[PDB]
């Protein structure tokens, strides 16, 4: 997979005259957005994790772009006025360390050119098109292996015309080295070298193939004629082509699997791979390194924590923790104030772990005096509890409970399955030793990877615990990968590709802003609940903001099924209540849901409720 | 998703003169394949499981087509000479029970059209294109909501030209009902009604939207002019469009995950769905009902068997069996003649199940005499064993071992992780009570679903047993789905969509033909092994044909790393040996690997082996 890209954007764009006197031409806007920002989104959407933008003229526009996209690094060609495009690539190259995509800044293009270059086996590969009749075409001459032998804007300087250079090229680091060595040795005589020229030179000794997509839909914008072609013809075509790959968007109001981006969905599609290959071990290592960061404050040293990934669900991860972190020499206290706390107590009981339960209401907060009293008996070495009790939307105050458990010398075992990545978390100041979550809740990937983020020292303390199971044993799963850079058994390979994409998108959003978008959706729902006269099971002060239990209207005209089927006709999936003794329904707002989508849902809810005489 | 399609294929193709005298025009060939078989392939590749073809003219071409694609059912309009296309749709209608794609038979098209209709939220939807300059165009007139209000081959008879009808339309069953009711009402006065006519009438009371894809690449073939645009321009363009979506193909010579079809890859891409929804409960039910049939002979009663699916790996599925099927009141005998037999023994011991181990060589066949003497001690209520020991490619003779165990009163627990779907199996005659496998080995899906196919009577016996774990407990996982039509926990939804496609493609290939394909590759590999002077660790007669353990060459110039890195440069992934005291490398041939591709590998293997002095 290609993880890096370079956008060459130091040019003056002089041929656009007034348009570029104050502005790089990448920041021309078609359809409401800078063309280069669209390219940045297309690159990240295909799993590019680092975008090196070589800046020069009006570099401020790009520095300000980088503020919106953490994947961008800007590097200025201070001499941009007196070099060509090769000089800008030269200041970028020290930032490139593997194979990469190389893009011009004045392009619009069908993103299927990204996919097609990434998925071609040839390592050095120019994307080319058929005839465009656009002006300023760079023509490629190719040999019988379709490899580059000449290039020129004068079609008569060439021995054949294979296609036109699009400006999107896949290259190895070694090919870049060769280009930068030829550019450097010609700093005096060829000061305005264009990157194409150095690539042609490099192609003499390293084969550089050309992939000719006859009908590839693209346009470069050097001047006003190009812009006319872009605005009137090429852009609406690109829009249509990219919408052909759009996936049916169902808005899920259940707490996960939730609505996903289509870039997370398509991240599941990749070359087949043997998961014991080094490259896949490096991907699993990167997933471990990056997952645990979403649970730590930036000032907490990451090396104090480990991630342990398993092929299993959230319940699986909870069972890993209960069944691997509490020796028979200790005693566990489980907080049961919901289905997931009750589940952990039943797991501990199945395993015959010494254990008492602290039972409390599913919708009103825990008594912390009574809880501290149970810590104070010194009977408990370990505590297992849930952060967000998805049963009702109750948020347990683990910023209070778990540091208190630590003050009593206890190890903390935390189900954060529906909390992690939806709100900021710092395991260190939260006093949390082991934390479980999954790949398909608030991180917004696909189901199938459960994981435990561990205080490394407390993880180590379990090295000599008797195993209670095999597939779900925390220490062995951790120890084997530390030793072999392989995971013990076959993992959900494609789901792990999806998880990496969801990790990149969580870094792009940041957890803080995801929390704000979740809470904005929640704010809309609660206001509409109040207007309709509906009642909330949990008091707002005590809620997670990620799911809201709503009491069922008393009128016999209501049923869950009728509201559910109506909402489903409008592409909204709602969720039943989970309590035997109290009738509720639940509306969650996680995943890719947008505030306007929750607004549209409340409109439909009001339609339905009004139709049965509620509100 | 959309599970059903209909092809109207009854007409004469008269405008094609001699080419259709003896043949339906759907069987015109471009690129070596009948255009209508090309359409069937793209339908099947997008998850369609039933393709109803309405026949008439020379219906025998379509009946022979149906022999090659089991998803096809042909139904002949006997009166095709005296109806139009709606009459053929009429005789197909009772075979359609859901929303469906409706297709003309003379089409070539970008398959993106299937994907785009399936993923559009509007339930009744005509695919349209911009102007084609093709002749015989069917023009569509649309209202301000892009819904159909008129159509004609005569441009001037319409108040507006919204686009051209491609001939691929998504409809509900209720829209089909309406169309058929209107056609029967007009049997007398409109006996040659075209299906377009009836759809326009339905659109007067049911909104039928039009999805206009301006640059959509397609062509219908009614005459020689159409055929020329198809051959010279449209078909090469579709080929290019479809190859832009191709995923890089690595040939995996490791035993799973292995090379997959791109249709299985893209089956993971779907509408987000809450797994407790009835629709997804129905999918998991379908998967259970279909997975167990690849482990049974047709003469075996599928009602005697259940499937229990989990979100775990093959080791997880083995652990499900070991930890849920043997109570402390019994005693388990584990056969250990390989890594996965040993693994089941290690799991057994961690749970403290009463057990002995029957150890044997990892590359000599087990002594059936010694094993029977162990069974005859009457000390064991349960046997656990491995069908295919992918450690070495050693295939245990379970068609002897497990019925013997049954004759001795034993319950049988079988890891068939690397055996199931690569060779015909019948659990009834094999005497197997519990059989595990996964979604990413010989069934050729994506990893994440581990499952246990159970003798129903024996599965129900385990209700009495104390739970030893929770996530991996067989009975509780079975019973919950039986009671609720939901799985206990969140499953790997998208992996299950891919498993469904892999199931559909196994049904298309058949397990017998897949065994032949695998064995075909294995033969090629074995013949090249011998030509090079390489030695196999397991005797041919005791091998599975699915993975071959090869002795590493003695020369210091050999290394697994060099051979692996050279192979990988040519898009082949090989696998290291697994054995403590014998140096081997392994070459598997499961997954979508083709024989020509195994031949290409042996050519590169000879290049490497000759390079270091092996093989003359
Ligand atoms: N294949 C090129 C057709 P064109 O001649 O229009 O090249 P450009 O003038 O559009 O420059 C190509 C890219 O190269 C960039 N560039 C140009 C000059 C320079 N000194 N540095 C650059 O990065 C520039 O910003 C732009 O994105
Ligand atoms: N949008 C269609 C306009 P066109 O005039 O090409 O219609 P065709 O003659 O090509 O037929 C359309 C389809 O309808 C089928 N058909 C036609 C006549 C008939 N009695 N039964 C059919 O199924 C036929 O085999 C063919 O595949
Ligand atoms: C708090 C909590 N814990 C555990 C789980 C179990 O997750 P899974 O269904 O993936 O087992 C969930 C499910 O919603 C959850 O919300
Ligand atoms: C016979 C056998 N049993 C068990 C396994 C373990 O399966 P998994 O890697 O999915 O855990 C394998 C996988 O190679 C196998 O071949
Ligand atoms: Mg130019
Ligand atoms: Mg340019
Ligand atoms: Mg026609
Ligand atoms: Mg036709």
Tab-separated table of N, CA, C and O and ligand atoms in Angstrom, chain A residues 7-13 15 25 54-55 62 77 79-89 103-106 136 138 153 165-167 194-196 220-222 226, ligand 1:
chain	number	residue	atom	x	y	z
A	7	UNK	N	2.817	16.689	-3.059
A	7	UNK	CA	2.184	17.644	-3.961
A	7	UNK	C	3.201	18.741	-4.249
A	7	UNK	O	3.661	19.421	-3.324
A	8	UNK	N	3.557	18.931	-5.515
A	8	UNK	CA	4.470	20.029	-5.860
A	8	UNK	C	3.616	21.272	-6.086
A	8	UNK	O	2.801	21.294	-7.011
A	9	UNK	N	3.769	22.289	-5.221
A	9	UNK	CA	2.907	23.478	-5.253
A	9	UNK	C	3.711	24.771	-4.994
A	9	UNK	O	3.229	25.705	-4.342
A	10	UNK	N	4.929	24.850	-5.521
A	10	UNK	CA	5.672	26.086	-5.387
A	10	UNK	C	5.507	27.090	-6.513
A	10	UNK	O	6.045	28.203	-6.426
A	11	UNK	N	4.767	26.739	-7.563
A	11	UNK	CA	4.759	27.537	-8.769
A	11	UNK	C	3.963	28.822	-8.651
A	11	UNK	O	3.076	28.991	-7.803
A	12	UNK	N	4.307	29.755	-9.547
A	12	UNK	CA	3.685	31.068	-9.551
A	12	UNK	C	2.318	31.062	-10.224
A	12	UNK	O	1.480	31.920	-9.909
A	13	UNK	N	2.086	30.122	-11.148
A	13	UNK	CA	0.875	30.101	-11.960
A	13	UNK	C	0.686	31.334	-12.821
A	13	UNK	O	-0.458	31.721	-13.104
A	15	UNK	N	0.518	32.210	-15.777
A	15	UNK	CA	-0.423	32.179	-16.896
A	15	UNK	C	-1.872	32.409	-16.485
A	15	UNK	O	-2.700	32.659	-17.369
A	25	UNK	N	-2.404	28.492	-7.520
A	25	UNK	CA	-3.530	28.056	-8.331
A	25	UNK	C	-4.187	26.789	-7.774
A	25	UNK	O	-5.324	26.478	-8.153
A	54	UNK	N	5.268	20.664	-1.128
A	54	UNK	CA	6.324	21.615	-1.414
A	54	UNK	C	5.761	22.966	-1.797
A	54	UNK	O	5.102	23.104	-2.833
A	55	UNK	N	6.030	23.968	-0.970
A	55	UNK	CA	5.415	25.270	-1.091
A	55	UNK	C	6.420	26.296	-1.602
A	55	UNK	O	7.637	26.075	-1.652
A	62	UNK	N	-1.119	27.234	1.919
A	62	UNK	CA	-0.847	25.832	2.209
A	62	UNK	C	-0.555	25.626	3.689
A	62	UNK	O	-1.009	24.637	4.273
A	77	UNK	N	10.209	25.705	-0.725
A	77	UNK	CA	11.322	25.936	-1.638
A	77	UNK	C	11.563	27.441	-1.587
A	77	UNK	O	10.834	28.215	-2.207
A	79	UNK	N	13.715	29.219	-2.834
A	79	UNK	CA	14.154	29.761	-4.110
A	79	UNK	C	13.161	29.488	-5.229
A	79	UNK	O	13.571	29.304	-6.378
A	80	UNK	N	11.855	29.465	-4.920
A	80	UNK	CA	10.885	28.944	-5.884
A	80	UNK	C	10.866	29.778	-7.151
A	80	UNK	O	10.558	29.258	-8.235
A	81	UNK	N	11.198	31.069	-7.031
A	81	UNK	CA	11.167	31.962	-8.188
A	81	UNK	C	12.173	31.547	-9.248
A	81	UNK	O	11.907	31.702	-10.448
A	82	UNK	N	13.322	31.008	-8.843
A	82	UNK	CA	14.414	30.756	-9.778
A	82	UNK	C	14.636	29.272	-10.067
A	82	UNK	O	15.593	28.920	-10.765
A	83	UNK	N	13.766	28.389	-9.580
A	83	UNK	CA	13.830	26.998	-9.987
A	83	UNK	C	12.541	26.594	-10.687
A	83	UNK	O	11.551	27.330	-10.700
A	84	UNK	N	12.572	25.391	-11.264
A	84	UNK	CA	11.407	24.750	-11.833
A	84	UNK	C	10.790	23.791	-10.837
A	84	UNK	O	11.086	23.828	-9.637
A	85	UNK	N	9.919	22.908	-11.340
A	85	UNK	CA	9.204	22.045	-10.404
A	85	UNK	C	10.134	21.026	-9.745
A	85	UNK	O	9.836	20.576	-8.628
A	86	UNK	N	11.273	20.689	-10.383
A	86	UNK	CA	12.212	19.728	-9.789
A	86	UNK	C	12.834	20.276	-8.510
A	86	UNK	O	13.048	19.528	-7.547
A	87	UNK	N	13.134	21.583	-8.485
A	87	UNK	CA	13.714	22.178	-7.297
A	87	UNK	C	12.801	22.091	-6.086
A	87	UNK	O	13.265	21.893	-4.958
A	88	UNK	N	11.495	22.246	-6.298
A	88	UNK	CA	10.545	22.077	-5.199
A	88	UNK	C	10.503	20.622	-4.706
A	88	UNK	O	10.530	20.371	-3.493
A	89	UNK	N	10.461	19.652	-5.630
A	89	UNK	CA	10.568	18.245	-5.238
A	89	UNK	C	11.870	17.971	-4.482
A	89	UNK	O	11.897	17.125	-3.588
A	103	UNK	N	2.130	14.281	-7.137
A	103	UNK	CA	1.040	14.992	-7.795
A	103	UNK	C	1.379	16.454	-8.068
A	103	UNK	O	2.030	17.131	-7.264
A	104	UNK	N	0.862	16.934	-9.196
A	104	UNK	CA	0.863	18.349	-9.515
A	104	UNK	C	-0.285	19.025	-8.761
A	104	UNK	O	-1.256	18.371	-8.384
A	105	UNK	N	-0.152	20.337	-8.503
A	105	UNK	CA	-1.112	21.044	-7.656
A	105	UNK	C	-2.301	21.617	-8.417
A	105	UNK	O	-3.243	22.084	-7.764
A	106	UNK	N	-2.288	21.608	-9.758
A	106	UNK	CA	-3.344	22.250	-10.540
A	106	UNK	C	-4.271	21.235	-11.191
A	106	UNK	O	-4.875	21.513	-12.233
A	136	UNK	N	-1.179	22.627	-23.946
A	136	UNK	CA	-0.059	22.445	-23.033
A	136	UNK	C	0.142	20.974	-22.669
A	136	UNK	O	0.738	20.669	-21.638
A	138	UNK	N	1.673	17.425	-22.250
A	138	UNK	CA	2.985	16.794	-22.205
A	138	UNK	C	2.831	15.375	-22.718
A	138	UNK	O	2.129	14.560	-22.104
A	153	UNK	N	6.406	18.637	-24.762
A	153	UNK	CA	5.192	19.343	-25.142
A	153	UNK	C	5.076	19.515	-26.652
A	153	UNK	O	3.994	19.853	-27.146
A	165	UNK	N	0.832	12.948	-20.176
A	165	UNK	CA	1.106	12.930	-18.745
A	165	UNK	C	-0.050	13.567	-17.969
A	165	UNK	O	-0.440	14.705	-18.244
A	166	UNK	N	-0.605	12.819	-16.998
A	166	UNK	CA	-1.686	13.357	-16.172
A	166	UNK	C	-1.121	14.229	-15.057
A	166	UNK	O	-1.692	15.262	-14.718
A	167	UNK	N	0.031	13.860	-14.507
A	167	UNK	CA	0.577	14.548	-13.359
A	167	UNK	C	0.407	13.821	-12.045
A	167	UNK	O	0.544	14.451	-10.988
A	194	UNK	N	12.425	20.903	-14.801
A	194	UNK	CA	11.096	20.448	-14.437
A	194	UNK	C	11.191	19.001	-13.960
A	194	UNK	O	12.138	18.277	-14.292
A	195	UNK	N	10.253	18.597	-13.102
A	195	UNK	CA	10.383	17.262	-12.525
A	195	UNK	C	10.248	16.195	-13.593
A	195	UNK	O	10.815	15.111	-13.450
A	196	UNK	N	9.512	16.489	-14.666
A	196	UNK	CA	9.386	15.526	-15.750
A	196	UNK	C	10.742	15.232	-16.356
A	196	UNK	O	11.047	14.083	-16.682
A	220	UNK	N	-5.724	19.551	-15.893
A	220	UNK	CA	-4.839	20.518	-15.264
A	220	UNK	C	-5.307	21.916	-15.641
A	220	UNK	O	-5.867	22.126	-16.719
A	221	UNK	N	-5.069	22.872	-14.748
A	221	UNK	CA	-5.566	24.244	-14.909
A	221	UNK	C	-4.364	25.181	-14.839
A	221	UNK	O	-3.948	25.619	-13.764
A	222	UNK	N	-3.800	25.488	-16.003
A	222	UNK	CA	-2.731	26.472	-16.143
A	222	UNK	C	-3.246	27.873	-16.464
A	222	UNK	O	-2.567	28.856	-16.135
A	226	UNK	N	-8.217	26.135	-19.776
A	226	UNK	CA	-8.267	24.958	-18.912
A	226	UNK	C	-9.371	25.070	-17.867
A	226	UNK	O	-10.074	24.090	-17.591
C	1	LIG	N1	2.997	18.755	-16.288
C	1	LIG	C1	3.019	20.220	-16.220
C	1	LIG	C2	1.998	21.035	-17.149
C	1	LIG	P1	2.319	22.665	-16.493
C	1	LIG	O1	3.438	23.247	-17.379
C	1	LIG	O2	1.036	23.545	-16.530
C	1	LIG	O3	3.267	22.723	-15.088
C	1	LIG	P2	2.912	23.875	-13.892
C	1	LIG	O4	3.348	25.264	-14.268
C	1	LIG	O5	1.344	23.774	-13.654
C	1	LIG	O6	3.729	23.401	-12.523
C	1	LIG	C3	3.542	22.117	-12.264
C	1	LIG	C4	3.621	21.931	-10.788
C	1	LIG	O7	4.838	22.090	-10.425
C	1	LIG	C5	4.830	23.193	-9.265
C	1	LIG	N2	5.894	23.955	-9.241
C	1	LIG	C6	6.198	24.785	-10.261
C	1	LIG	C7	7.303	25.558	-10.223
C	1	LIG	C8	8.128	25.493	-9.075
C	1	LIG	N3	9.344	26.299	-8.944
C	1	LIG	N4	7.773	24.663	-8.128
C	1	LIG	C9	6.675	23.906	-8.212
C	1	LIG	O8	6.404	23.193	-7.325
C	1	LIG	C10	3.509	23.965	-9.539
C	1	LIG	O9	3.107	24.718	-8.363
C	1	LIG	C11	2.646	23.097	-10.045
C	1	LIG	O10	1.794	22.405	-9.119
